[PDB]
Amino acid sequence: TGNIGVLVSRVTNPFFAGLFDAIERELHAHGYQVMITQTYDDPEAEERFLKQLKSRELDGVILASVEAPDRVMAVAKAFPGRVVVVNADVQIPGATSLVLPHYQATRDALDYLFNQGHRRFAYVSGGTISGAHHGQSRTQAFLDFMQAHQLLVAQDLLFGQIHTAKEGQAVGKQLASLAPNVRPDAVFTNSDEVAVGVIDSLLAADVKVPDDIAVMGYDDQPFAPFAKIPLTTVHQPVASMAAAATHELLKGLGRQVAQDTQPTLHLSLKIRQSA
Amino acid sequence: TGNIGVLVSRVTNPFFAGLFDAIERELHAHGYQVMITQTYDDPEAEERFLKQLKSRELDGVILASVEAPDRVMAVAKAFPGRVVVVNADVQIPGATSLVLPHYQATRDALDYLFNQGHRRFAYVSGGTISGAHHGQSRTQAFLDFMQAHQLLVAQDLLFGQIHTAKEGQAVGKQLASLAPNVRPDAVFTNSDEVAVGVIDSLLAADVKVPDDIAVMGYDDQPFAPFAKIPLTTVHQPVASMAAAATHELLKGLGRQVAQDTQPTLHLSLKIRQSA
Ligand SMILES: OC[C@H]1O[C@@](CO)(O[C@H]2O[C@H](CO)[C@@H](O)[C@H](O)[C@H]2O)[C@@H](O)[C@@H]1O
Ligand SMILES: OC[C@H]1O[C@@](CO)(O[C@H]2O[C@H](CO)[C@@H](O)[C@H](O)[C@H]2O)[C@@H](O)[C@@H]1O
Ligand code: NA
Ligand code: NA
DSSP states (O other): OOEEEEEESOTTSHHHHHHHHHHHHHHHHTTOEEEEEEOTTOHHHHHHHHHHHHTTSOSEEEESSOSOHHHHHHHHHHSTTSEEEESSSOOOTTSEEEOOOHHHHHHHHHHHHHHTTOOSEEEEOSSOTTSSOTTHHHHHHHHHHHHHTTOOOOGGGEEOSOOSHHHHHHHHHHHHHSOTTTSOSEEEOSOHHHHHHHHHHHHHTTOOTTTTOEEEOSBOOTTGGGBSSOOBEEEOOHHHHHHHHHHHHHHHTTOSOOOSOOOOOOOEEEOOSOO | OOEEEEEESOTTSHHHHHHHHHHHHHHHHTTOEEEEEEOTTOHHHHHHHHHHHHTTSOSEEEESSOSOHHHHHHHHHHSTTSEEEESSSOOOTTSEEEOOOHHHHHHHHHHHHHHTTOOSEEEEOSSOTTSSOTTHHHHHHHHHHHHHTTOOOOGGGEEOSOOSHHHHHHHHHHHHHSOTTTSOSEEEOSOHHHHHHHHHHHHHTTOOTTTTOEEEOSBOOTTGGGBSSOOBEEEOOHHHHHHHHHHHHHHHTTOSOOOSOOOOOOOEEEOOSOO
């Protein structure tokens, strides 16, 4: 029981820190040393990380983000059992790949918001909304939602490449500056980090949350229940997906026996105060 | 420009995630691949990590926590230039070691609290307060403070091995349960994670923060200004200490030239709302 690598886009995203922690504590119990690297969405960084597996510095790798699927596939095919992909909205041939139903969860969350009476929506993404991007199952869900309700997408209320609370502060400051009749009713943030920042700037401008603008988080990160306006958010089952990923790696490594069990990884809407 | 390891106690501590991120972005710019491991205070995990340097899997290591100084010293002496220690309240012979003045900062923060009128203090530590522990410069500062003001230490208001927001919730629930005359005036939490949890439980019990109980954070983590009651806290200069650590590693590796400059790493009290 050797060295395992975990790859994520950004360790200061509490979702990824928490996912790492749950994987690492289990793998550690099994005798492995686990190390994490971050990519900042650079395919070169992914490729460099994978060279560690190719050179057998690592026994195995868990990727919780993927930049170049075809590159990951070639490595997985050369190293059967040693590459696991978790929650990256992709199935990589040659790697056991765990996908969660983010499209569904996003539709469900948007539906919740529509049902509270909201009609003018702002949509925030960590990707470039116009092109191919991470979190595009979610973007499609948003577009499908709007079409299903015959809601015109306001291009001025779309915000791409927004990741952090500080970036969310900038979004929220812009939204707070708007005249009530062009202000959104609700903001789908795609991230609890972003949501905390958005809400802070709204509140600083005496915009009421949720009465004036409802704010939907994503992930149910550790700080979410503790936020100034406790976050309504989409809960990701961090502990369960970590256990699943870990097991699929350990099985591939010949460590663990197959289980008949297969608990399903569920996203759930967590209603608090912000929406 | 090869592989660098960073060692911390816990990646879900936002202080360590942020310190890692600042180190990693700089080292990445210099062509290195950086990976982080967590120890959970297990000396075995530290020793295993150091074997990576001993076997030349890694070019160098930055430790932001230290479990067994004498073990780290033996490695540093065998691998000159390749071990840097940052903000671990220890100078390790053979490793460039950066120490920040936590005793001073702690005294200063406690003094701030005394000056606001507080007299009955609760003290929380991530260590076992009675024995040798991480963060013991801070514990000594606390004891020295109390002695300097002839304040009797209440053993019932000392809380050890408290790290997370959930643990802080438990502390805060206990404190909120107390009759006003044995309730503390102020709580020194040693951690913004702990402080968020403490405050949440106080507020849940209609205890006023800071009017009934003032809560002092530590670190000035990303969420601190965004907390329900924005945290008064001790600010650690994460970006500056990361740059310093990185430079001392790169110098040791023969990458970088010596600088005459040497900006001093300052802790500062950040006053917000919670105290
Ligand atoms: O760090 C945010 C950035 O990471 C990606 C993957 O590269 O998504 C991750 O972060 C989201 C927000 O915390 C999670 O909801 C998602 O499950 C996770 O993979 C990007 O899509 C995002 O912009
Ligand atoms: O994770 C908390 C735990 O880490 C230690 C070092 O092992 O201290 C770190 O965390 C503190 C709280 O965030 C920081 O103030 C400190 O600078 C940092 O080294 C323990 O002392 C603490 O219990
Ligand atoms: Na409204
Ligand atoms: Na008081």
